[PDB]
Amino acid sequence: MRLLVSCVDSGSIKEVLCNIGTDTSVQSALQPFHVAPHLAEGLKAYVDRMWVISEDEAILARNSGVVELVKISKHLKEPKFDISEFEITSSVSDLFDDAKLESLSSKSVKRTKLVDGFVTLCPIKKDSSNNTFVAATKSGLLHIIKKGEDKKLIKLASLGLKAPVEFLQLYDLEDTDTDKYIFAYGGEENLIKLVEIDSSFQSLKQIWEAKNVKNDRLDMRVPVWPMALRFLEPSPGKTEKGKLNYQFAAITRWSHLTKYSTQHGRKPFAQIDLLPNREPLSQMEVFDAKGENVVSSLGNFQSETFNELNVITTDYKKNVFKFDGNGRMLGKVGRDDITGSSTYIHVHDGKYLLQGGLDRYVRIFDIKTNKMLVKVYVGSRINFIVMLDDVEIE
Amino acid sequence: NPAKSASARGSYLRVSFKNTRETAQAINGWELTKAQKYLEQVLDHQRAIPFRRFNKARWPAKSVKFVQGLLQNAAANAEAKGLDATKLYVSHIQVNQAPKQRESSPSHIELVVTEKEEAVAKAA
Amino acid sequence: NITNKLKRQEIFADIKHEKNKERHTMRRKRAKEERENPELREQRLKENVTQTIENTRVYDETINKEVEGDEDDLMRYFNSNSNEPPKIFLTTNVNAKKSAYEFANILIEILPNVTFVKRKFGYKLKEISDICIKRNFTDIVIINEDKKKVTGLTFIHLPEGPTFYFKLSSFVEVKKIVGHGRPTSHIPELILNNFQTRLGQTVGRLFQSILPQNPDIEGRQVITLHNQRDYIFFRRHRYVFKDNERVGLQELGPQFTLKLKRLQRGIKEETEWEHKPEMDKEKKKFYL
Amino acid sequence: SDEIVWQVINQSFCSHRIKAPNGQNFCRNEYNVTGLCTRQSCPLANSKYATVKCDNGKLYLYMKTPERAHTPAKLWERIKLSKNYTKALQQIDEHLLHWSKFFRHKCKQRFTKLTQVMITERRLALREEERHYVGVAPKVKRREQNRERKALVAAKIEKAIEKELMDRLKSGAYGDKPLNVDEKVWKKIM
Amino acid sequence: PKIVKKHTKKFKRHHSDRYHRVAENWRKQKRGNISQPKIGYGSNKKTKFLSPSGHKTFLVANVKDLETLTMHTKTYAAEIAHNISAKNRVVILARAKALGIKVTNPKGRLALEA
Amino acid sequence: AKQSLDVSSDRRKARKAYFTAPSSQRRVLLSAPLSKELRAQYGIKALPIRRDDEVLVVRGSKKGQEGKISSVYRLKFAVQVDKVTKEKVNGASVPINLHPSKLVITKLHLDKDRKALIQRKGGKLE
RNA sequence: AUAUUGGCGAGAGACCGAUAGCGAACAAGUACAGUGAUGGAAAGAUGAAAAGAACUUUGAAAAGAGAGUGAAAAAGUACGUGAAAUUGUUGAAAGGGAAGGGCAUUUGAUCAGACAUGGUGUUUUGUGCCCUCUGCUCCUUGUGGGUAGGGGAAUCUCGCAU
RNA sequence: CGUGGAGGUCAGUGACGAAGCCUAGACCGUAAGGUCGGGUCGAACGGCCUCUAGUGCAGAUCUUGGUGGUAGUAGCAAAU
RNA sequence: UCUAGCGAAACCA
Ligand SMILES: [Zn+2]
């Protein structure tokens, strides 16, 4: 297994070559074959988001608003294996706008001040040879980055959204042939909104907005802080004329799993208190219980049935949760081994779980058996990991 | 403070309890080496153990033998802890009764020896 | 075997008696043989080693590992600047009693540029943080008292610095100390002990930042924070550099015990580390 | 039968009835308006009955008729009360028209109490909570005390202080003839 | 109202200090310097069973018992039973402050951490 | 409940039966349930454990461990599995006396008596 | 068909819970006493697991002290829990051949002593069971109960938030 | 008013600590007594309506056990 | 005759 870890405390990446069963916490256990620091740029500019294009290049998100294309090589470690060496080829800068964020710092739930981050780094198109990628800020700035034919990153557009955008998910299910580019986004009292952008990437159109539920048991307004989202297949049966054909699910801050059928309408037809006392939730991943890969490359759950949906989330404490489509807890994941708030989790290939957070520990978990596969100390706070191909050296 | 303090404990000690209480009250609050030299003078009948409650000053040998055995034990424990010998004075001592039969009156002797403190002259 | 009470007690006590007889004779015979030869004494003590818990701790890679980006993080999340002294803010919790006021008065003399407030009802922590930022306080200290006893401490570095919640267990005043000593205006030196884990180095850099730098060498005063078994001990002392090469001490001000309960990113935002009793049951990790 | 049922409930075992230290009695009957178990109070002893009672958010007037003495599943009739306090008291007086003074009076009282409880709960939900309650297990407390004692006795911290002070001194870190150390003693080190 | 107590002290047996085997409960003997219990010391019927807070106490085991004091808040005061576990005591306290009932013994088996 | 008169429900009789049991009855008492896989293999839930077979631990402080049984300590109603030991401060090793109700058998050691027992209990033995 | 404080077995108890219950829950008709006939005790609880304290050291030896196991030695084969009588040390006070309490008050020491922090009216804006339109559903069929979709607060109005 | 046991009930309490013990801690009872805090502790126990009794102790030179002073005294096979 | 060691019982609002 090869891993690339965005290491915050160094402001770098680390390449990890380790086999199944590697545990750094025990001397008797398997030790990792190779640990490689790369591209250390200080804590002010740590890696936010990485996009691997198949092998030879990766895409980096700075905290300085800079998006970087990096050439990836392999060279022999001098049990034999190649290690990887990194070379930045192109960079596009100046994509953050903290002025609205310090402007909105009064109406803010968190106690710390607000700074911009690249929340979304992904292609716009499910088809390959896209060379047209998106970069989403917390400031609502959506940037259209083109890989040039001279192999140079060039920005095409910089469009605005509403203020704080905690998350932005693209819809990649069906009809890649048609030029229809659907995404959703939301944030602190910023409703989940479906927006189509034009395929010429010069204009967007907000096509849908959610609506809030009625008042609670205490007749209070329910606070709106959605945290994450994925898409499903649209509604089967008869479409209702002029509603929309979209079905998708989301995780709020206040422990609500919220399901959305646009055929039903703008209000949640289903909202679930997952945890007592409205515990904060951080990320949201979707998975098959048997480790199967049932999602898109952007992770959208390729089914129509909300009851088939199974999710994994994290709080701001040390907890990793599993839930069904109804909110019943399928279990806790590696609860006895983590000690930190898992900042980052990810379902890799259906059957592996990337974990890394404040614990300074990279944890490959099994999806199906719920067993820890690999534990690695890295010496840095973790916010993002990509997993390369499985290698099984010796 | 447990750090600058050693301890010695004796249990079930088949001695006359009343005589041991007197000779333990005689030794309290003394420097360790001076108290041991005093106990040596007791064995030569040079200086006697004064009797206050259970009574004039005798020389009860069997009590003093076990007492200085515990004093050697506490000194060895202090040196294993690595304390000063000259600062080391007995601070606490207590005798109480052991159970009667397993008519005799045995006892539990214990003592705590402590380094004498020395203060620091303040600067400016 | 035997289940009668008085038979079994007697038999096992006599077995103990014969055993301790034999052990005394054997150590005395070894003592005679090591009177003769000082080699096999050394061969015994090299042969068998007295196991202690300090000897046997679960291996951690955080021990003796360098911190990545330690200087930028050290200026970032900590106030580590000789140019900028810290504004320290004392935040004694709502409806405080007299005991926490006395402990705050103690803590005045420890910390530099320290400022006290009496909290009032209805001020949220974001509002307080905003006001302390506008007044350029760089860290706030919250005393949590309960039942007229100071039980908890909270440390927050203000420019989005990390939150620390320590549990104070045992506290001794100055007057209950026998070797009393009188502290002076002189800035003490500082001692940090056994902070070698990565979280321990984080906490050590925390206390290194919060405590005043630049000690007064004239007034021979020192403070100390010892770490043992996830129990840190605060004391403070006066120097006697003896001719006999052992420095002499007098425990000047108050002593207490702290234990980190919670280490959180930011101003109560996300928790890096917590304490649990299920962590305590393993009894050999000692998360420092 | 109501007075027979009442004297059974009174002179023998009312399962809901709770006995105070004062001597006063208290029904745990969920429909009972007053807390008490008295002749007017037990809903079991009376067939005409009414009660302000809240289901999750909304407050409902619950009516009990002698007409439905049988069929206790279909027993209670429910009326949604208005959020206007005045209008809901008017609704109470409407549905309790030609009705006795006790049920209307105590029913208005219970309505006011429940609405003010709603107000205080909204307040406490909005109220900031720094401290949270922790009960401490005695097992945990004893481990804390004894292990702090074992750590303090184990670590002879004073000797290690003397060690690190000699380490800082011999390492340097004080210059030539420091103000800490006497000059003769420092020359003995030198 | 103004609570009269009629007897501050306690009523002890004659010669109760003179022997350790003799208890301190009132037992009738079968000088006059010993206060003897009698019905004249019985307190006023309005003032009887009143705390110094001015309430009548009421033992509460769980939340359903606490809800029985919903209407009589100013008259009574809830007291948590001695054997309630600490998980339930915080729930009882939150529910009681929601109901606005004075708890006689808060902070029993409980501490406030952070 | 108890329908036969010849069955008794006295606690004192039941404990006196339990603690004074002969060893042939004890191996019937010392029984462990099979795995879901072994139930899918043979169609049978629980079996008298012996020492030659292989097991996993599903409760206790040593939960999620496994091994071959070293020896069945029938006198203490207990069973020493190999490699689940406490290592003393001398360095020597002593196994945890496990209890077969807290164990799940993973790999059976099949014998002719064992195969015939599976057959008489209705097993679909391969 | 009847009796059955014995034998061989069962099954029960509004029985006693280790000074009780058989003398005997335990190596009890035992130890022991009597020449004998006979009489006849006391004595239950480490822990979940002995994991029963490796090793160093004092120590004739008994016992220690470091150390460690254990969730707990505030469980160390003197062992669940561990009352009183009584003993030792320290602290405080009093006494000088002083005895105790009752009342009442000082002094000294000491403890308790809000998770209290709201209500009323007005105003700003926002939101929803508020308004409007379009539904669905349960019967106790009414002075009902639940529930959906879209729109609006541009105006009114209620509740909520502000 | 209190105690052992029994029927019903509180979907009573309880390993986040029952019962018991201590409590120069508070409260309610005229009292018999009851309630809570704290400490210790480790596995069961209470309130209410009834039933039932081997059901309430300071003495009986009561029974059994434990511990005093006498007293380091008498005295040295007083048991060894 | 003294020391040391061992060490009672009678009786006891
Ligand atoms: Zn009633």
Side-chain angles (χ1 to χ4, degrees), chain A residues 11 21 29 32 36-37 40 42 45 58 61 65 79 99 117 123 135-136 140 148 157 160 163-164 184 186-187 210 223 226 228 234 236-237 242 249-250 265 268 270 276 280 289 291 299 325 327 331 334 340 350 356-357 379, chain B residues 2-3 6 8 10 24 26 29 35 48 50 57 60-61 69 74-76 78 80 82 85 98-99 106 119 121 123-124, chain C residues 13 31 38 69 85-86 96 100 104 112 122 152 159 161-162 179 181 183 188 200 204 212 215 219 248 253-254 266 277, chain D residues 14 20-21 23 27 35 37 42-43 45 50 57 66 69 72-73 88 125 135 137-138 151 154-155 160 172-173 175 178, chain E residues 1 23 32 37 40 42 52 54 61 77-78 81 86 94 96 98 100 106 108 111 114, chain F residues 1 14 17 21-22 32-33 40 43 46 48 60 64 67 78 91-92 95 100 116 122-123:
Chain D
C14 184
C27 272
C37 180
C42 270

